[PDB]
């Protein structure tokens, strides 16, 4: 048998019957894994400010009481007013509209187009912004790679540092993600007493106590130059350079 | 609640038109129309069928019969068509029996090709004298331990016009029968009633179609005569299935209608004078019979024959009268028998010994010349294994040996 | 221009079959003889090639979120269109050829019937929604992949017919052999691996 | 020894006991006596060449190499050592490592006015080891399959075992040499059937090996020279991050000229340094006709087509694009690998033709990974490995033709 | 005269080259037919040990080629009958004695070349002179009623230490232009005859054509003949012949009787005087070299030391196609790390050896085959030696593989296995691609 | 039924026996917890669309077919997707498109065209499961090697201290990057044909 009609039922009937689950399953669990992603940077975001944190129920709770997600325009400095909750700074950069395309010598970090209005995260502590992380993401050797650096009121003090994404070849450029590397960024400052970028990745190790250098990561001269164009493109005036220079000036406060 | 809805109805509309297309795309791509299969060329011989299924079926449906031994599957490789045209490349299984200057000449397996596409094919008119019958059971008397012959009457009388030494193919439909009925003289039961053979039930789901050799020689007129061994179960296996169409065929009895399809067969003598020798086992003293007796009462051959059967006693041993007349009617074809375990009421004083190493030591020890002879092997795989390795061991070659193999 | 950095980049930088072990059932099945790859290869471009652009029509149209109606999105959906999409396209290629085109059915139509669910055809489509890329931008993607696809495949092809004279030890002979020579294959292939094309 | 082995033979005999052990008393009895066999049909004269005068042909072709690699490794070391440590702490640093304190102890001075023959003999105690581990490992793995199999140990061994400890850096941990070795001997060669018998380049398959599964010890500046403590870029790698005028040896403070680098006086793997060695040497495996000419040819084009072409279109940004070729051709590994690698004929083309393209190919892959990518230093290894890959089909796109031409009979 | 060149080939300069005089030469008493020689014979004997034969007397059949006789060359009686493993017909002995001989009809020398050719082929078939004919593809004796348009008559010799045919052909200047007419006549087209540069008879028929060859040892066979003059295959068969048989059909046609005597060039490194000497097909080596080869342990070979048969038992007679003796030294000396020597006295096509230097040199080689049986790497030795456009590097591979498929498209079919000796002289693997041909060629008649 | 099951995790295991399901192995072995995951997405795919097949393979229509069993196959994947988005997300990152491929995956695909249909629902069951488990074998050992030597760990935990964290173990590059999958695969075969020669190709 192979009657044309009888072959549409049975097509349209699977269809219907397979799309009530599928349906089903795409919104009802639309909010549960929204939530999911979420969770997974307010966590990170928690790491980087030193505030600890197991569990989910733990990381909301501490996650609302401290943290504060702030718009600011880039080429202003100053603050901005909207959906800073959500405000997807990766699709606006894609975006021409929300997007600046950078010329050959402004583009640094080898980054095509930079978001108009960047989103940053002040850790309160007792109502008093305690320090201020910035998302600042550069060119790798191999990918992009994209960090959360912690800064003092002064806007000058770097107090930590993590790379939440990166593939950099493990060993070699991985080592971004190295503990002990990141607890050595502690304690630098980002900028010289003239108020221009200082700091540095110096190959082969670092003068011990070195307020600007940082050393370098063994065999990964690729990976450190894009880590420096990174630091150095943002925070320079088309990075948070303008915005750090606010909070020096006691912006937030 | 509210984009379920749309979500629904476009799950429903991309698969929808998906089926459409590819639904509509059938009716104006492809063809329904039947697919003639022209015979020789021959508009009285063309049939036509639907799209489907493999080329045998339709012969079969048509009532042209093709050789099915291994019954589809490119095992046998029996069923050969010259399809001129047609039928698509040849597939791997069919290049194992056709070799590629058969494949260039057109030989294709009719049981692998499916027939998707109008195309010619060219067969001898042999084929179409292939036709089955129903023939009546004359008889089915036991003839030795393990071996029974099953005389089959021709309805109308008529005759297979089939040449010596050719087989046809018997179909069994479903049953289920038990050794005990089977009438089993007790001339024949000694060993029989050793084993217990008896408590052995073959059952059948599925007809069945199996090739079997004729023992009656072409101008043997409306008379057909098998010498069917019995398939039991090898001693080590004794609960393994036991044979089904040998059961079957040990079940019949006079009047018993038995279907056969035919006439078949390759192993046919050669139109030479060289010696032949025959070497005979088991089931295969029928084809050494026709082969005998045709080159003595049909071709009236005066060639020089040598037959060597192998047997275990004098009750396994039969047809010796049989050829013994002929060799009185014919000096220039000797027949020869061997025992090899003959039994005290056989009163043997003739050969002994296993028939292959016997008829080298009388005939073959001191043949001047016997490399030219030519040598038609039929038995069990170890008769046949040890004598074409013997007639090898005596630098035969392979052009000349052809081998019937019963499956054995 | 674009289009040819594109174009390379989905050949030799971008390699499904080796880069991504995208398709590689059929690429160690049928990569026995040189003509049967090379034939399997012109398949895959043509289907990659008419489905990458297709597909991408009809993300953009009614798939992308925000895009049919406002406030909507149907990405769910994106697993069952591309394939179901996908599928039509083998099929119907295989018939039209075999009624319009009887030459070309007996060249391709032989291989479309296993391209017809492909890991590799499903693949690009996959990472080019993953990706922002325009229809003409698909187009050389979807055959730039083709290429890289089928460059793998008859190269592989070449190297087992240089086999022929190999004495494989028995049991690695066959299918063992050819992972470990694919393997190798993609050794020879990361050179490029670090080109940011 | 004749007579000793004669005797001997009964032992290693399917009846006598150890015959486990024939496949390898077989090669110590084809090795120092030829055999006596003599031939049975078709040509009943042969030519005096057989496979095992055309790896110790090879195997001795690189000896210039060897010899003046293990000079320059030294060499670099101790103008290294001197230029970091001085007096005392140089003395610690000697009783530390049992590469220098082995060479004082058999009479080479390390300090800066060491001779020719104490260099050369600090390279010695860096090259030998690793020699002597990839020879071993390697040669087990070799007679291992051979004996399993109950085949002939073929005679293609010496020369992946030698030409693979002559391109790692010199300081080699040895366990990973064995690693090094054993990929290459095992994946790559024994599991295709053997010498003739594959399709890859056995050496530059092991490196590979090391090349990625531990980049760390064979790429950056910290193992080119066997100074502890010394951090010096190679010359093309130098090239990169500056430009034509920022190669200077660190060690000496003194440029590194185009005579320099042709003589081998940089620093770089054992086998790689000098190119004036390798040509000497190269030149009597192709006179020999051991090593074919084409290929050498072919990539000589294809170098020096990429090379050109990429000065012509230049460059701001990218310092490597204004490289000339000729300083192409005297860094790196290019020079060893387009003499003694590139020339496998079992990886290379079977066909004439095939060879140009196989040779060419080469050439502008080994160019590209050196300008285009900036994630490996230079590229020759990863260029012959692409190369080998698609080796076949240059010979069968060249079979296609020929077989159409006999299709129409030549035209007759 | 249309002149072609060969540049890719080795001549081997093997010492004690033949004076290319010809002698009497010794009194041969025992002559035989080599059964193993002709390619795909089944032979059907039609003599017994003891039967009295005569000068075309049919010894035995051929089951797979029917209507082929095959006749003694001299008159006697048979002696020996051997048969080696599988009763293969190694070769039939027999003593020459008396006269007796079986006459055939004579015509004049003008009324060849508008005999019949029903008449020419009865005449061959039963004179036995048709077994001179072998068909390129597959190198067997032609059947009875096939034909040909091409029929290549070689009346060169490059063979190393062979002989001269000029020497030869002035002696039967006659016999060799009536042999050409027969021949012309035969052949549905044309004949082609291959010579060198010397000035050879002439037939005055359209259809005979002389070929100028020049070159190394390649361009003196059959095989590179073909190639270059009329492209062989499988729809497409040539026949060949060497010039001595030619002289032998021109003889028969002439006179009405077989024609036996041949010029063979017994000659070699370890010949006390090398020379031509005139014999019977089918001669027993073992009385031709009688107290003419040097004390030690020899090999005597029959045709060319590339490509013969070892003359050992009952080998030890001249073969059909073969019209050359030579001697070696059988090299089972070992030597210490003779695999890596200066190369003075070793020949090799490389100039990996120091003997290359020494131009003009000639080399007693022996049997030794200088190295062991290994794998073969091809460091391109073989592109050197094969003239013929194929790809001999691959080509060698698909034999040793065993793809008989694959050697027909590279052009294995228009081979044989004195087209390859070159090659397995060359090889550093010390193969032997003679008898892997002749296995793969087989399968596809066999099978194809 | 344990004997029926059983059978194909060895004598006909989908990857070396036959080749099916090889993209998702040689994709998703770089870390043991990604590749137990991806195995129970396929075991359980595999039998839920083998079932429903079954119980509909009566009604299936010859000339859209695949259409069918695809659109099952893939509203089935679909689901298991939110499932895995919803929790175990960092897995499902980790999978990538690969979880979108378990709807082309040929093991899913092959064993619906084969013992899926004309066969009885529940034996078709028994069938998908038994094929997954198989299939899971394979990934298992080659992850299991993959993750012990590449990283020196077994689902996150540390087996072999690294150098990095004062160990004694240099994890080794190769282990994580495509190779190191094609080779564990030819010899991971090459140990199963020894021990089961009925399976060795002539
Ligand atoms: C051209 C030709 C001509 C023939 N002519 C004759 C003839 O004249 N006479 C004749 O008697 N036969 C003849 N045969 C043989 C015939 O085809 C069968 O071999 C025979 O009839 C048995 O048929 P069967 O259906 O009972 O076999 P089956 O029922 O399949 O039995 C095969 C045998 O193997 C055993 N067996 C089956 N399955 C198993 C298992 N799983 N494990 C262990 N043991 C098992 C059975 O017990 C039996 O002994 C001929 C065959 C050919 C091809
Ligand atoms: C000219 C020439 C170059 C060779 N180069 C290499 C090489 O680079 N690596 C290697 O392992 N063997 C080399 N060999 C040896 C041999 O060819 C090789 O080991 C086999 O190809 C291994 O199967 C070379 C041999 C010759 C004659
Ligand atoms: C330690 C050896 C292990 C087995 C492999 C031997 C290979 C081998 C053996 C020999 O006798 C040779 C003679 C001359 C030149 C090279 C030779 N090679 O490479
Ligand atoms: S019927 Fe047996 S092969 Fe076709
Ligand atoms: S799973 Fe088979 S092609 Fe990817």
Same mark, same amino acid.
């Given at each position: 048998? $192979?009657?044309?009609?009888?072959? !549409? ?63 600011? $325009? ?86 930590? !540092? ?9 060993? !070699? ?41 940082? $050393?370098? !990561? ?13 630091? $150095? ?21 | ?408 | ?84 999409? #996908? ?71 070449? #190297? ?27 050794? *020879?292939?990361?050179?490029?691996? *670090?080109?940011?094309? | ?8 033979? @009964? ?32 040509? @009943? ?69 060491? &001779? ?181 040819? &072919? ?26 070729? @000729?300083? @192409? ?84 | ?68 006789? /095959? ?32 006459? /055939? ?47 290549? +008559? ?13 020497? =030869? ?93 041949? =010029? ?13 000497? %005139?014999? =019977? ?45 030579? +001697?070696? %030294?059988?090299? %089972? ?19 990996? /050896? ?7 040199? +000639? ?45 027909? %498209? ?39 | ?202």
């Amino acid at each position: 048998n $192979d009657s044309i009609k009888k072959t !549409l039922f049975v097509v349209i009937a699977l269809s219907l019957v397979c799309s009530i689950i599928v349906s089903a399953a795409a919104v009802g669990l639309r909010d549960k894994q929204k939530e999911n992603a979420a969770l997974d940077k307010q966590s990170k975001i928690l790491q980087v400010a030193g505030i600890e944190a197991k569990g989910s129920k733990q990381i909301v709770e501490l996650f609302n009481k401290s943290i504060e997600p702030r718009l600011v $325009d880039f080429n202003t400095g100053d603050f901005v007013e909207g959906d800073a909750a959500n405000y997807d700074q990766r699709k606006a950069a894609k975006e021409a509209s929300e997007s600046i395309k950078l010329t050959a010598e402004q583009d640094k970090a080898k980054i095509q187009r930079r978001a108009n209005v960047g989103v940053v995260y002040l850790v309160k502590d007792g109502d008093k912004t305690s320090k201020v992380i910035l998302p600042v993401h550069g060119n790798g050797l191999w990918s992009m790679m994209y960090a959360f650096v912690a800064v003092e009121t002064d806007g000058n003090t770097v107090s930590g !540092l993590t790379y939440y994404e990166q593939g950099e070849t493990p060993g !070699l450029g991985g080592e971004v993600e190295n503990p002990a590397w990141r607890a050595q960024w502690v304690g630098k400052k980002l900028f010289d007493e003239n108020h221009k970028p200082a700091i540095k990745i110096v190959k082969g190790g670092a003068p011990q106590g070195s307020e600007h250098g940082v $050393d370098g !990561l063994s065999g990964a001269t690729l990976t450190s130059n894009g880590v420096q164009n990174t630091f $150095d493109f943002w925070l320079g005036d088309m990075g948070f350079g303008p915005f750090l220079t606010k909070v020096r000036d006691g912006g937030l406060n | 609640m509210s984009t379920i809805i749309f979500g629904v109805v476009m799950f429903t509309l991309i698969i929808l038109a998906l089926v459409l297309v590819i639904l509509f795309a059938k009716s104006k791509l492809v063809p329904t129309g039947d697919i003639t299969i022209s015979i020789n060329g021959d508009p009285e011989k063309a049939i036509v069928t639907q799209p489907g299924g493999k080329l045998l079926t339709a012969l079969a449906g048509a009532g042209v019969f093709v050789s099915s031994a291994c019954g589809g599957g490119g095992s046998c490789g029996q069923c050969r068509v010259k399809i001129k045209s047609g039928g698509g490349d040849i597939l791997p299984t069919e290049l194992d029996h056709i070799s590629k200057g058969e494949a260039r000449e057109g030989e294709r397996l009719a049981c692998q090709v499916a027939v998707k596409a109008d195309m010619d094919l060219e067969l001898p008119e042999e084929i179409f004298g292939v036709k089955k019958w129903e023939c009546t059971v004359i008889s089915n008397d036991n003839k030795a331990t393990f071996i029974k012959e099953l005389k089959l009457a021709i309805p109308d009388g008529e005759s297979v016009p089939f040449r010596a030494g050719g087989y046809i193919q018997i179909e069994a439909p479903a049953h289920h029968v038990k050794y005990a009925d089977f009438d089993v003289p007790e001339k024949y039961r000694g060993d029989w009633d050793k084993f217990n053979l008896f408590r052995y039930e073959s059952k059948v789901d599925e007809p069945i179609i199996r090739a079997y050799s004729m023992a009656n020689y072409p101008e043997e007129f409306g008379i057909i005569m098998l010498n069917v061994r019995i398939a039991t179960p090898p001693p080590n296996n004794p609960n393994v299935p036991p044979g089904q169409m040998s059961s079957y065929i040990w079940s019949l009895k006079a009047g018993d209608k038995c279907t056969i399809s035919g006439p078949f067969g390759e192993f046919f003598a050669k139109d030479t004078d060289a010696e032949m020798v025959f070497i005979g086992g088991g089931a295969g003293m029928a084809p050494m019979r026709s082969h005998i007796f045709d080159q003595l009462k049909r071709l009236k051959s005066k060639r020089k024959m040598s037959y060597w059967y192998g047997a275990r006693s004098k009750r396994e041993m039969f047809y010796v009268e049989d050829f013994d007349g002929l060799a009185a009617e014919n000096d220039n074809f000797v027949w020869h028998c061997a025992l090899s375990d003959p039994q005290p009421e056989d009163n043997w004083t003739g050969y002994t010994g296993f028939i292959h190493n016997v008829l080298y030591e009388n005939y073959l020890k001191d043949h001047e010349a016997p490399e030219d002879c030519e040598y038609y092997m039929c038995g069990p795989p170890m008769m046949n294994a040890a004598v074409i390795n013997m007639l090898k061991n005596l630098g035969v070659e392979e052009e000349n040996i052809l081998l019937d193999d019963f499956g054995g | 221009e674009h289009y040819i950095s594109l174009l390379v980049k989905s050949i030799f930088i971008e390699n499904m079959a080796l880069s991504f072990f995208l398709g590689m059932c059929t690429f160690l099945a049928v990569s026995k003889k040189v003509k049967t790859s090379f034939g399997l290869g012109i398949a895959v471009i043509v289907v990659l090639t008419i489905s990458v652009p297709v597909n991408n029509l009809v993300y953009n149209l009614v798939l992308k979120p925000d895009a049919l109606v406002e406030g909507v999105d149907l990405s769910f959906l994106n697993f069952i269109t591309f394939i179901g999409v #996908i599928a039509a396209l083998v099929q119907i290629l295989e018939m039209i050829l075999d009624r319009f085109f009887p030459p070309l059915y007996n060249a391709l139509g032989i291989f479309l019937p296993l391209i017809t669910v492909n890991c590799a055809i499903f693949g690009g489509v996959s990472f080019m929604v993953q990706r922002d890329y325009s229809f003409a931008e698909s187009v050389v993607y979807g055959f730039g992949s083709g290429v890289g696809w089928m460059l793998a495949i008859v190269a592989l092809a070449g #190297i087992r017919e240089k086999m022929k004279y190999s004495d494989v030890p028995p049991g690695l002979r066959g299918l063992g052999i050819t992972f470990i020579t694919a393997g190798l294959m993609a050794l *020879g292939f990361m050179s490029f691996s *670090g080109v940011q094309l | 020894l004749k007579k000793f082995l004669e005797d001997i033979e @009964h032992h290693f005999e399917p009846g006598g006991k150890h015959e486990k052990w024939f496949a390898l008393y077989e090669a110590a009895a084809t090795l120092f006596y030829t055999p006596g066999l003599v031939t049975k049909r078709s040509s @009943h004269v042969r030519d005096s060449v057989d496979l095992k005068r055309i790896m110790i042909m090879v195997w001795l072709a690189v000896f210039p190499a060897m010899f003046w690699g293990m000079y320059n490794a030294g060499g670099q070391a101790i103008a290294a050592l001197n230029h970091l440590y001085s007096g005392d702490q140089l003395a610690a640093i000697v009783a530390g490592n049992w590469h220098y304190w082995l060479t004082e102890m058999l009479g080479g001075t390390m300090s800066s006015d060491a &001779g020719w023959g104490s260099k050369m003999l600090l390279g010695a105690t860096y090259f030998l080891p690793i020699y002597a581990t990839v020879f071993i490992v390697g040669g087990f793995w070799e007679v291992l399959f051979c004996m399993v199999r109950k085949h002939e140990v073929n005679e293609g061994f010496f020369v992946t075992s030698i030409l693979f400890a002559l391109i790692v850096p010199p300081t080699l941990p040895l366990w990973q040499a064995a690693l090094g070795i054993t990929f290459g001997v095992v994946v790559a060669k024994e599991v295709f059937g053997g010498t003739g018998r594959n399709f890859l380049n056995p050496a530059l398959a092991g490196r590979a090996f090391l090349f990625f599964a531990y980049p760390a010890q064979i790429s950056g500046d910290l193992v080119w020279t066997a100074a502890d403590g010394y951090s010096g870029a190679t010359a093309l790698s130098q090239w990169a991050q500056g430009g034509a005028g920022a190669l200077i040896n660190n060690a000496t403070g003194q440029t590194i000229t185009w005579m320099d680098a042709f003589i081998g006086n940089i620093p770089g793997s054992i086998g790689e340094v000098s190119t004036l060695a390798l040509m000497i040497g190269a030149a009597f495996i192709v006179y020999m006709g051991i090593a074919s000419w084409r290929i050498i040819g &072919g990539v000589m084009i294809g170098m020096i087509l990429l090379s050109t072409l990429f000065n012509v279109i230049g460059s701001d940004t990218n310092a490597m694009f204004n490289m000339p070729w @000729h300083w @192409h051709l005297v860094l790196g590994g290019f020079a060893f690998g387009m003499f003694f690698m590139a020339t496998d004929p079992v990886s290379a083309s079977f066909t004439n033709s095939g060879k140009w393209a196989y040779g060419i190919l080469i050439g502008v892959m080994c160019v590209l990974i050196r300008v285009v990518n900036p994630a490996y230093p230079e590229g020759m290894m990863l260029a012959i490995l692409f190369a080998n890959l698609f080796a076949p089909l240059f010979d069968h796109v060249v079979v296609e033709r020929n077989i159409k031409r006999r299709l129409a009979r030549y035209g007759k | 005269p249309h002149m072609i060149t060969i540049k890719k080939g080795l001549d081997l300069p093997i010492a004690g080259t033949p004076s290319q005089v010809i002698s009497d030469g010794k009194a041969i008493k025992k002559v035989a037919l080599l059964g193993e020689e002709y390619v795909g014979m089944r032979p059907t004997m039609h003599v017994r040990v003891g039967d009295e034969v005569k000068k075309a007397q049919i010894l035995f059949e051929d089951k797979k080629n029917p209507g082929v006789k /095959f006749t003694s060359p001299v008159s006697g009686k048979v002696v020996e009958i051997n048969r080696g493993a599988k009763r293969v017909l190694q070769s039939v002995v027999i003593e020459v004695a008396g006269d007796d001989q079986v006459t /055939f009809d004579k015509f004049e020398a003008n009324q060849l070349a508008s005999l019949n050719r029903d008449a020419i082929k009865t005449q061959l078939v039963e004179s036995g002179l048709w077994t001179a004919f072998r068909t390129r593809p597959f190198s067997k004796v032609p059947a009875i009623d096939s034909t040909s348009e091409a029929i290549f +008559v070689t009346a060169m010799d490059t063979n190393p230490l062979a002989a001269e045919p000029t020497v =030869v052909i002035n002696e039967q200047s006659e016999a060799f232009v009536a042999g050409l007419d027969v021949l012309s006549a035969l052949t549905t087209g044309k004949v082609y005859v291959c010579k060198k540069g010397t000035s050879l008879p002439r037939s005055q028929q359209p259809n005979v054509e002389e070929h100028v060859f020049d070159g190394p040892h390649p361009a003196g066979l059959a095989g590179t003949h073909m190639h270059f003059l009329y492209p062989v295959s499988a729809d497409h068969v040539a026949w060949s012949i060497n010039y001595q048989d030619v002289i032998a059909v021109g003889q028969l046609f002439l006179t009405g009787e077989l024609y036996t005597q041949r =010029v063979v060039s017994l000659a070699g490194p370890v010949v006390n005087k090398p020379r031509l000497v %005139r014999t =019977v097909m089918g001669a027993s080596l073992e009385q031709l070299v009688d107290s003419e080869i040097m004390p030690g342990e020899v090999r005597i070979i029959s045709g060319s030391v590339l490509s013969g048969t070892k003359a050992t038992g009952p080998h030890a007679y001249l073969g059909r196609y073969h019209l050359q003796v030579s +001697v070696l %030294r059988e090299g %089972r000396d070992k030597e210490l790390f003779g695999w890596a020597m200066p190369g003075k006295n070793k020949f090799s096509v490389t100039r990996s /050896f120091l003997g290359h230097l020494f131009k003009g040199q +000639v080399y007693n080689m022996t049997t030794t085959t200088n190295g062991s049986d290994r794998s073969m790497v091809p460091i391109g030795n073989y592109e050197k030696v094969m003239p013929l456009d194929m790809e001999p590097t691959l080509l060698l591979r698909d034999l040793c593989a065993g793809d008989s498929d694959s050697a027909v %498209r590279l052009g294995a079919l228009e081979l044989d296995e004195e087209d390859l000796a070159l090659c397995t002289f060359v090889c550093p693997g010390k193969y032997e691609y003679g008898q892997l041909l002749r296995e793969c060629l087989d399968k596809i008649e066999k099978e194809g | 039924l344990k004997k029926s099951v059983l059978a194909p995790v060895l004598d006909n295991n989908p990857i070396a026996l036959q080749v099916l399901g090889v993209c998702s192995a040689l994709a998703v072995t770089t870390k043991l917890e990604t590749a137990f995951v991806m195995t129970l997405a396929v075991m359980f795919v595999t039998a839920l669309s083998n079932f429903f097949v079954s119980l509909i393979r009566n009604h299936i229509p010859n000339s859209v077919r695949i259409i069918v069993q695809m659109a099952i196959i893939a509203s089935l994947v679909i689901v298991v997707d939110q499932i895995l988005k919803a929790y175990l997300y960092d897995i499902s990152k980790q999978l990538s498109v690969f979880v979108g491929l378990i709807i082309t995956n040929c093991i899913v695909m092959g064993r619906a065209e084969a013992f899926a249909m004309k066969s009885e629902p529940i034996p078709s069951f028994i069938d998908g499961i038994g094929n997954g488990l198989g299939y899971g074998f394979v990934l298992m050992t080659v992850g299991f090697f993959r993750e012990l030597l590449g990283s020196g760990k077994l689902f996150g935990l540390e087996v072999l201290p690294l150098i990095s964290n004062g160990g004694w173990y240099q994890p080794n590059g190769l282990m994580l990057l495509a190779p190191s999958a094609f080779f564990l695969i030819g010899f991971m075969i090459w140990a199963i044909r020894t021990f089961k020669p009925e399976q060795v190709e002539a």
